Structures are given as structure tokens and as C-alpha cells.
Design a protein around this nucleic acid. Sequence first.
RNA 1: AGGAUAGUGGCCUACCAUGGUUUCAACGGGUAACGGGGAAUAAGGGUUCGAUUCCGGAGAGGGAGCCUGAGAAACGGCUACC
RNA 2: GAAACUGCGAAUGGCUCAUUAAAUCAGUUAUCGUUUAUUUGAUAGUUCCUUUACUACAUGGUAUAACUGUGGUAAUUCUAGA
Lengths: 578, 226, 96, 260, 132
Amino acid sequence: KNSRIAIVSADKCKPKKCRQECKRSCPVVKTGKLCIEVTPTSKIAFISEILCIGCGICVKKCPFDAIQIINLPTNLEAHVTHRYSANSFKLHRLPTPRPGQVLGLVGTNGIGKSTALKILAGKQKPNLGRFDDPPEWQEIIKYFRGSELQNYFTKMLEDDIKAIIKPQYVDNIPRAIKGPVQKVGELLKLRMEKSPEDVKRYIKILQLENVLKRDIEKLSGGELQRFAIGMSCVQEADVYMFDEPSSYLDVKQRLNAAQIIRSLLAPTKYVICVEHDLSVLDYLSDFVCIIYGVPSVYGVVTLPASVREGINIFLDGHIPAENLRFRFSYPSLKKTQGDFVLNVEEGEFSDSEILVMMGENGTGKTTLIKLLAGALKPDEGQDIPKLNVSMKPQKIAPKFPGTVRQLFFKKIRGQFLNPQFQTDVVKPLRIDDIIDQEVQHLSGGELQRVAIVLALGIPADIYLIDEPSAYLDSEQRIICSKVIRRFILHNKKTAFIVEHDFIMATYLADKVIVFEGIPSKNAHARAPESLLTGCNRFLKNLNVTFRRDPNSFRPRINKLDSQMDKEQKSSGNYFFLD
Amino acid sequence: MKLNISYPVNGSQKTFEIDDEHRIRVFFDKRIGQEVDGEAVGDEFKGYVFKISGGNDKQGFPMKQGVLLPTRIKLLLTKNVSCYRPRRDGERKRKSVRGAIVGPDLAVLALVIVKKGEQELEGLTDTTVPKRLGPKRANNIRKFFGLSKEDDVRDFVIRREVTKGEKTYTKAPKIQRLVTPQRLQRKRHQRALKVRNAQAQREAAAEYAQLLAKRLSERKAEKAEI
Amino acid sequence: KGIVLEKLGIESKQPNSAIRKCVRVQLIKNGKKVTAFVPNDGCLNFVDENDEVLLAGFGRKGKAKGDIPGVRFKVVKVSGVSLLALWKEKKEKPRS
Amino acid sequence: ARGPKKHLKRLAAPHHWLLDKLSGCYAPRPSAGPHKLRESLPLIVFLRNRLKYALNGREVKAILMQRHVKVDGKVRTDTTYPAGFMDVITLDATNENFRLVYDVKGRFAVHRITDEEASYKLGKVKKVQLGKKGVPYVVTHDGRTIRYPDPNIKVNDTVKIDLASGKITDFIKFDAGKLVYVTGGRNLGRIGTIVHKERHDGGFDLVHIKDSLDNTFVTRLNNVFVIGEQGKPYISLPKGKGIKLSIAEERDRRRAQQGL
Amino acid sequence: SDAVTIRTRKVISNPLLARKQFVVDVLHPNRANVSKDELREKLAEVYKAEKDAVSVFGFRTQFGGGKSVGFGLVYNSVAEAKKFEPTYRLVRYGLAEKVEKASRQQRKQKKNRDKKIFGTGKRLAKKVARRN
RNA sequence: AGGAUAGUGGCCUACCAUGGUUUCAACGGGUAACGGGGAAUAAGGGUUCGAUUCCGGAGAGGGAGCCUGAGAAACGGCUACC
RNA sequence: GAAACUGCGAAUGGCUCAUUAAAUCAGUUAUCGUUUAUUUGAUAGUUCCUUUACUACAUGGUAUAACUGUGGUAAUUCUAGA
Ligand SMILES: Nc1ncnc2c1ncn2[C@@H]1O[C@H](COP(=O)(O)OP(=O)(O)NP(=O)(O)O)[C@@H](O)[C@H]1O
Ligand SMILES: Nc1ncnc2c1ncn2[C@@H]1O[C@H](COP(=O)(O)OP(=O)(O)NP(=O)(O)O)[C@@H](O)[C@H]1O
Ligand code: SF4
Ligand code: SF4
Ligand SMILES: [Mg+2]
């Protein structure tokens, strides 16, 4: 049912004063194996993890109440809302779509969230870990009766709650539905019903005023994520869902997205977000609802918490229920397309070193990469890559039927054969499932990790990388970034890294180029200067600032205007403690 | 610091983002209520004289009236007194509130005015608010226009139209504390009722005297027989 | 309910000459060292060192059952399954 | 516990409202009124349970709120108003009139009365004192004070009240040779005229009573309340006539003779 | 169907509510159950007041079968019936239509949200608009 | 004799007196003790249980104080300290 | 007819039994030692105390929420001015 385990350290958990009863009255200590290791000494009582059966006998008769008792995460054929078949991912609790407030749903990547959202929508129905008969709603209702969803699901059965979801991926929505006409224009008009004024408010407060005359396919994923959310938003419906809305978007444009999501919530409506967030989930949701488990094996959803409190528990780890641990050169080229002026400045693209890009969505960072690789251009002059070019795509919704192993044969596993892909991930979160299994059915951070391999895979040094933070969280992001840095610094390469995330940029960065200008008009890429001044340039134009969380070193965006915000505006610094 | 000025006669008001410490060196070490000249601040407020009513310091705490000390202190606050509103009846609460001594730590001085100077301001001097609820009670109506007490109230009443678009109309205020036939009927009925009560008590006590008399006759005269 | 300590080989009284195969158990609640008999034929190989077992008394209320010195308790469940169910091949013991 | 009790459960209420154990947790607490809590009977109880006119509380409220029914010929719109002993419940439903008078078993039967009897009621005088400005006054069992009474009317006597007016139309003195009803307790809803009274200093004047069959008994004076003269009761008595048959006569009359 | 035979036992006239109240007893061999709608159709043969003016409700079948007991009402006019009959029965009869609004706990949540806002609350929205 | 209470009253003040309880078991200690209405068992007498659907009491983490109301020492009221 | 002001309600209920042994408690009195909102029934024609001018008694004054608009704070059914 669970794995009970002991924990030790406390305020004057005094082993020297106590005459150590823990050691004196533990059953495992008195049958060979030393579980609790202690003496009359200056340090703390040490107690093992693996050995401890549970019991809790030491807890009761330890003289001070130092040693508490915890329960660790393990599957026990309990609940089980759905599986696929066997040696596959399962899920246990889908829950309270509590209304009148937006519901945050957080976890490390490939944990079930998306699947749960689909289940809530009523598209990918659950099966209780069994191979069900034709529409067996009855049985599932009986299984989750005595609880809120009985009502919800029965309503869904008679479509008195109409379904809508923002999909996980972005590249699939333009390709699947080949519309008669593009733009925002008519395709939005056919989607919307609600009213004339609300749509005007949405598109206006979304600060676009760009893609009103332009086809979707041309639009970059960021301006495209935006459209996706808009299409989800205006659709007249009872239920509302946003499966990872705030990925590869600007820091300024994330907040107002959140506040447009907020628009829908109040009058007896249900809203369900998913997000891998910094501290922008402060505004997204009211009710954060963490999910734990093992990636691609089992996932359990904890009952909802307050946003503040929930984010704070996600960091340390332990909670009221369980305990999930957690913690050379290039010239000034002038490039154009149709409704754009993408200019570039001269720069020093040094050997054995990184290069950091930032900017607003539509600042031209992305097409640059395409042109460097091979697509169109130039009308006057360029510098060909010396080293073999290596490219990373943003619009990732691929199709290689069969399996991922087969697709891995197109790269090679036998180069700098000592870890590389294992150092990225192998022991804690595991890669076995990701190395097997289809790519069609794989989720965000794992699909993204597919592309992180397709980079240090074909023989190549000069590297183009834009938005790896797409569909990843603080667990998967930081270690991955560290690994990337270790790769390109140790064995002599050059890489043009482009991030929207603050931690994934600043923990790596050294030379920082800055994009500048208004979308669907202009674009200027400023030369690589210091990390401080460049970052200020990036953020002075966007008009937003951060606060380092003093205990843990973590970014927290400010509230547009505030007491500290104004000091930062007047001083200039948007990053403390280098 | 930010400033919030409001001219009471016209009913206009505006904020002013005032940076630079030398521009606001006069306001420090002063109390709420005291008059302050605007010539020392700058040229836009030259000639004006400002009275202060309240204010808010950092972290959005108000300045309590004349309570001294330029620091946030914890005070009991009851109903019918400033810087608090009670939910439950007779609920007293302790809240941290700052004094009326103006210092560096302030955020918004809630400035009012006294005298209008030589220069005219942009927003405040020009515009004037229409004062919303006009006199409801009869005496206040009579004092607004100045009608002594023999001009009638129905003809002289404050008005406001309501143009919908298709079908226009004009709803008016109800008056209270005003004479009608109905009140005169009520007072009359009250007095009459009282009179009827009195007469009924008078008539009732009379029969008691007769019954008592009869008792004295039948009983006390019967004692002479034995 | 209790854990265990070790398996025993209790030398039985006269005339009933045998070995009884009991277990020393440390409980959860007080955590007192107790001895406890294991019922049925075989069935000492089910339980191991460290294992959650729910004990019952014999019947006699305190003191020995019959021929076993010191032992005043039997068992009921081991890993929350019942020894009776295991002896009779009905149910299966979990690995953990 | 920190003030008055507004709720009231079933079971706690008296046995003589004929409240079934089931079909509810709570009972109607009688509102603060003329009569006491335990002795009296709510109007809701008189309507849905006894007369069978209304089924729910809804219906009762809908009947009461349209005036029609009235205790003492007065509106009386509240649901749980305590209608007690010897009260006239005037209804407009086909000119029906009702008097609350006790039965054999100490309950309130649906006893109809004439239109002439609806004019008046009775009342046991509980105290007689001087009010303000030396005016004497009486007080009945239902709190109906009457100003300027006759000096003959002393404590324990009965008064005939006119309803339409707060006046004393008649009074009857307390002794043997009068028809004497008895409320309260064991001998509740009986008639036996009084044989003789007993004084007892320090409260509790046990009166001796003798019914028509000469089965004498004793009751406490506080629960005793007279009615009229011998063979001339001022109110129309119900079936039974305040006699109380033994279980033998019950098994003779009520489950043998009455059958078809 | 066979026999049917409606029997309105324990008849009480109710002047104070303008109705009659009675016990509908039915003898229905060779058919499953009694059906209220059919009894509404056929109760007007004895009383004569259309259908909606009358009303009925309240039944249960006897053990075994062939018979059904029930408790019911007959109001005189339609308006009286509308105003005195409980709201839910009208829906069954098809006169009124119940506004199918939000869940009970949902309404309670709404109430709490309304408690949490002082005054009308348009001021807060306007303040937010000036802010951004 | 005052004060204080809606009030009697060592309830509390100042003065005066030397009393009150008790082995027909006070005073202390324990209670895995809220008290009753009852429950289990029953030849009769009893023995054991009664947190628990009714009455009464007490407390809303521990204590102490208080506003407001007819009514609280209230806790889905407040105040401080732990 | 939302909002707010006023008036009532929120001391009933529901929950648990930790303390508590002549204390709670049961039956049983008493308040001629008392408070009692609310129902219920009765209930102040004598206040301009110069009822000789005295101010209106065809019935008079003080404010103030919701409100319009200007904001403060990271934040709570925080609230500041005008
Ligand atoms: N149809 C399917 N067939 C096989 N495996 C699946 C299928 N759907 C999901 N999975 C697996 O279930 C895991 C979790 O699914 P999902 O809820 O989409 O991940 P996630 O937690 O939303 N990831 P992310 O949104 O990037 O954080 C993935 O690791 C998949 O390997
Ligand atoms: N043929 C075309 N005509 C007009 N616009 C185009 C065309 N092709 C691409 N674009 C857009 O021109 C923009 C150039 O900005 P781009 O470099 O893509 O920004 P970005 O780095 O993608 N930032 P983000 O959206 O946050 O990822 C893109 O947003 C494209 O969508
Ligand atoms: S834990 Fe309790 S017992 Fe083990 S050492 Fe610290 S104090 Fe002594
Ligand atoms: S918990 Fe059970 S096992 Fe882990 S230490 Fe205390 S006793 Fe030994
Ligand atoms: Mg996913």
C-alpha cells in the first residue's frame, strides 16, 4: 500500500543527551543489519532509507520528538483510473475540476497530466487498467461515484457540458485542418460565437495587431501559440482547458496570456491549466494540484493546494499526504520575406565558446537560424559554416511510424560513447521507456529530449538551438542545460543558444546578443556585449523585472509595478548574486 | 513620492508623480491638517495653499488623524471611527496604522487645497464635477434654492433626465419629511385614539364607583340587622 | 500487531516431546519483546525476519497454551493475509 | 446554554400531541404565547394531524396566511401558535367552529361547537391584585387580564370571558355543588363536582372529587378548574363526559358492541 | 387492461384550500401498474374539472398485483391549483417549468464570492482598468 | 457594617469572634469516571456496561480577559501570551 | 429592483467528552433574595413647567453608506482622501 520510512534531523535532536533509544529499541538494529547508526557524538543520528521496514516504533519511544515518520511513493494496484496495456504508463487519480477558479496541475515531465486533461475533456476515455467493452460509461461512473465526478461525467454523457481543449503541440493544428482561408480574419469568425466585443477585447489585449492579414503557416510558433490560445478562447463552450499554454513565449506576453485565461473563469465555469512554470503560475491559477510518481510508469495526483503554498511545497518536496523528493565571425546581413525587415549587425562568433540570444517573439532570432542552415537568401553576401551545421526545430510534432529505436538508427550510438545521453538522464527519472515506445504517443519533455539528442548525434560542431525549455520544468531544465554546457565547453564546439526561460539562459550565459524592434515591422540584432547590460537591454524594452528567491536561488517575476519594481527600474539591475 | 490633489469646490482631482527629494523637502516633519505653501515646491503650484487630510505610506497603510509618531503602530479600532470598517456588530480589531507625522517613508500624501493661486492647473482648475445626489429632503431643497417656506416643493425639485434612445423619460427624487393629507390624517387619528382611550378610562372608573356603592349599601347596611 | 525479531525452536515440556517453532516478536505500540507461536503444519517458512504480523492470544487468557513455556500468543495474519488462508492454498502472499 | 432554546426535537415534546416517532426528527416548538409549552397545542398540530385538512407545513402556512382561521376571533398568522385549553378556533370553512377541551386520555379532540357558544370562553383566575393607581385586576390561565373586576371574584374562581370584549359576563364561586372539570396529570379530563377542599399550609391544596359513578379521587388544586352549576355546564362537553371508563368497559364498548 | 374501477375513499372536502382530498383505490387486473396520466384523463368522469384544475399525485401498488392504493387531491379552479399545489408537481403535470440552474454547492460558492466583495463591485473593476 | 451584582450570600473589603469538618469514615490518592433516562444478563435476589439517537452538564489547541446584545465570557466574535 | 443603511438573526442547532466525585447529576421544593428580548392581554389625553407670545407642529436639524471620480499596498470579505 505504501513504503513507510523514518526521518531524523531536528532542532536539538540531541544524540549526546538522550542515551540513544532509537538504536536501543529498533527491531532492525536487533536483527543484524544496522539501519539506525548512532553514538555519543557531536553529529546527528544517521538512519538509513532502504532498510527501514516502517513500523514506527522508534518514533514513539525516542525521548525527544525528533524522529518523524514519512511515506514514500510506490504503486499498489490502488485506484487506477487508466492504463494502456502492460509495461506501460498508468494513472490513478483524476480530480475536482473545482469551478469558479483556474486549476493549476503541475509535475515533472511525462507524468500523465496531458492524458488526464484528455480524460477530463471526454476524448480519450479511461479504462480502469482493463480492456473495456463498447461505451462502458456506467462502470466507470460506479467506480468514481461517491465523488464529484459522478455528476460531471453523467453531464458529459448527455453533452450538457460541451468540450474544448488547447492541444499539447502547436505544429499539428495548422496541418490537420487545412482551412479555406487563413489570417485571423475569417477562421476566427467561424470559430467564435460568444459576441463581437469580447473578441475585440481579446485580440486587442493580446497585444498582437500583427497577424490580422497573415496566414497561420507563416507565423512563428510563438505568435502561433498565441493563435492556438485565441482559437481555444473564443470557442463558445461550457468546459475550458489549456494544456501547456505558456511555452516558448515572451516574459511580457505570458502574463497577459494568463490574464486572458483568467477572463473565462468566474460565472459558474470550470477551468483547468497545465504548466511548467517559473513563478508565472501565481496568476494562471488559484488551485495548484501537484502530480507525482515515476515518469512513464505510474502517476498519482495529490488533492489541490493554494497556489503560493503549492509552489512552495513543490520545491522542498514533502507534503500533507506523501513526500516526492524533487530537491569566428559573421557580417551585417539585411534579410526580408514579405511583411518583415530582419536586419543583422556584425559580430565576433568566437571558437570553443557559447553565444546567447534573447528577444521578444517576432524579433527575428528564429529565421536567422533557418538562413544559416539553408532555406533562402542572400541577395548580397554571407559566411558559410566552417564546421558541419547542426539544427534544432521548434515546431515539433513529427511522424516516423513504427518506433523511436528505428529512428535512432539514423543517428549513431557509438561516438563519444561514454555517457553523454546517460548523463542527461538514466538513474533517477529513467530513459528506458523513452528509448523504446512510439514517438507518436510520447509526451512534451520526452519528445523535446528526442530533439536534444538530435544535435550531439550526427557528427557536427557548429550548433543552432532555439527553445529547448519547450515542454520542460525546473527538474528537467537545469540538469539538461548543465549537461549541454559541459558538452560544448569540454570537447571544443560553438553553439547559438536561444531561450525564453531566465534560469536556462543566465546559468549558462557569457556573451549575449539582443534582438530589438516591433513585430511584423523591423528587427535589429545588437552585438554581443556583457551579460548584465545585454540582459538589461532585453528587459528594459519588455518592462518587467525579477526577484531572486533568497533561500533557493529561483526567479520570481514582479507585478508590473510595485515598491521593489520601481527601485529596479531606477537602478537598472534585474539579476542579483552572480 | 506620488501626490493626490483634489479641489473641493469644483469637485475635481488629479495625481502628480513628484520625484526628486529637494522638491519635497518642505513637506517632511509636518502634521496632517497644517497648511503648506506650494511656491517652495515649484512653479506649477505657485500661489496655492494646501491643507492635508490624510495619506498612505509604504505597504498601503493609512495615516491616522493626529495620532503622532511617524511609524506603523498596532491600535484597537471600533465602529464610527476612521481607518477601519467592522464586519460583525461591535467588533473591535487591532490593526497596524501609521501616524500623521509626514516623513521619507510616505507614498501618497492625500493633499486637499485651501487657496487657488495665480497659475491655473491643467485638470483641476478647468473641469468641475456634476454633484450627484441633489437634495432629497424638503428642508434641504428649500435651503438649496432659498425659498423661505411658502413656495411649494413639487415645482422646485432637482431633476435629471433618462434618454434611452427610442423612448425617453425623466425619473425624479422622492421627498421625505414632507406634508401631505395623509400625515394630517394620521396625527388626527392618533390624537383621536388617545382621546377615546381617556374617555374609555373615565367611563370605566365610574361604573366601579357604583358597584362599590352598591356593595357598601347591601353589605354594610346588613350589619345593622344583626 | 507487531513486527518480528527471530524464528525460534522452543523445547517443549514433558510428556509432549517436540520442537514448536515460534517467533520472537517486537510489537509496534509499546515495543515489548514477546514470544508467539505459529499455527498449522509447516508455515514457519512463510514469515521471515522483519514482517508485519497481526497476533492473537491462544484462548486460555494469559500463561501457557498447553506445552509451550513462556508463549502466550499465537498469530493471525502475516503481511495482512492470514496464515489460515496460506496453509490451505487459497490466497497468495505478496513479495513485499 | 447561553440563552433560549428555539429548536425542539420529537420525543422531548408531550405525548398528547400524538406525534409519530418517524416522519421527522424535530417537532414544532410552540411559540411564546398565552399558555405553557407542555400543556398547549400548536395550530399546525391541530390542522395536519387532528383535522387532516393540510398534509405539509406548506399547506398549513397557506391556510393560515389567508386569514380565514383565527384563534379568539383574531388574525393569528404564525405557524406554531400555542392554542391551549378552552380556546375558540373560528374558521370560515363552511362556518365551522372548534373548542379545545380535554378528552378521556388527556388529548385535544376535534370537538365542534355552536355559533352561539363561539361568542364566549372561560378562564381560571390565577391572581387578583391592585395595578397602578389602585385599580384591581384579574389574570386568567391565558394571561387575559381584565381591569375593574367584581370584588366577589377571588383566587381559584372561574370567569366567563366575552372574546369580542375583554369583560366579565359571569363568575362562578369555588365550592361543592358546582360542576368541576379537572386538567393536569393523572386525572386529566375528568368531571366530579368537588366533595370538599383541604387547606394544607405551605402550598398544595389537594381537592377531593366525585364523578357521576361515585368513583372518587383526589387532585391538586392548580390542575383543578371548575365549569358550571350542578347539571348545568356552561360549555358543551365532549363524548365521554369526563367520566373515564376502566379497561373492562372499554373492552365491552370499544371492541365488541360497536362492531358491525 | 381489465376492470380499472376508480374508488375515491376517505373523502374530505376542504373549503379553506378550495379542494377535496381523497384516497384513490384502483382495481387493475391484467395490466402492469396504474399510470397517473390515464387516471388524470379518467378522473374527470366523476368530478368534471378538465385535468390541470383537478390534480392527483400519490400512489403505491399492493403486494402481489391487480390493485393499487393512493392518496390524492382535486382542486376546483386552475388558478387555485397553481397557487396551492407544490411547485414540483406542476412540472410533472406539465404546467410550470423549473429553472434548471447551477449546483447547490456551486450556488454556495457564488454566495461566498459575493460576500467577499463589498458594495456593488464595479468600482473594483474600474480601478483595475485604470491600473492597466 | 459597607462595596459589588439583576440579584440573597465570605462574593469581596475593614473590624471583631474562634470556629467548621471528621473513623455512622473527613482530608488526600486513583479512576482506561461527563451524570441520568437506559443496555446486557435474566428463576428470585443480583453483577457488568452506559463515548453513543432523549434530558442535563462542560469545551471548542492551551489558559486568561473583553466588546455587542434581552441573552455569550460566545469561539464558523475579538483581544493578548504559550 | 442589485447594492448599501437601518432593524432583526447569528447565544438555536450540530459536534464531541478532555476535565469533573458531593461538583455535574436525578427526583424534589423555593425565590416574600431576582433578570426576562419576543409573543400574549392590558396600558401615560396634565412635557412650549411663565401651559402672558415660545421657536413651525400643516410636523423642524446633524450627519453619512451605497454612489462619481483620484489613489495607496506583494497580500486578507485591507482601505485613504475629495
Ligand atoms: N497512447 C499512448 N500509448 C503509449 N504510451 C502513452 C500514450 N499516452 C501517453 N503515454 C505515456 O504516458 C506518459 C505521460 O503522458 P502525458 O500525460 O502526455 O505526459 P505529460 O506529463 O503531460 N508530459 P508534459 O506535458 O511534457 O509534462 C508519457 O511518458 C508517454 O510515454
Ligand atoms: N513569408 C513570410 N512572410 C511574412 N512573415 C513571415 C514569413 N515567414 C516567417 N514569417 C514570420 O517572421 C517572423 C520572424 O521572427 P522569428 O525569427 O520567427 O521570431 P522567433 O525567434 O520565432 N520568436 P518566438 O515566436 O518567440 O519563437 C516569424 O515570427 C515568422 O512567423
Ligand atoms: S533521535 Fe531521539 S534517540 Fe535517536 S538520537 Fe536523536 S535523540 Fe537520541
Ligand atoms: S522506522 Fe521501523 S525501521 Fe526505520 S528505524 Fe524506526 S524502527 Fe527501525
Ligand atoms: Mg504532456
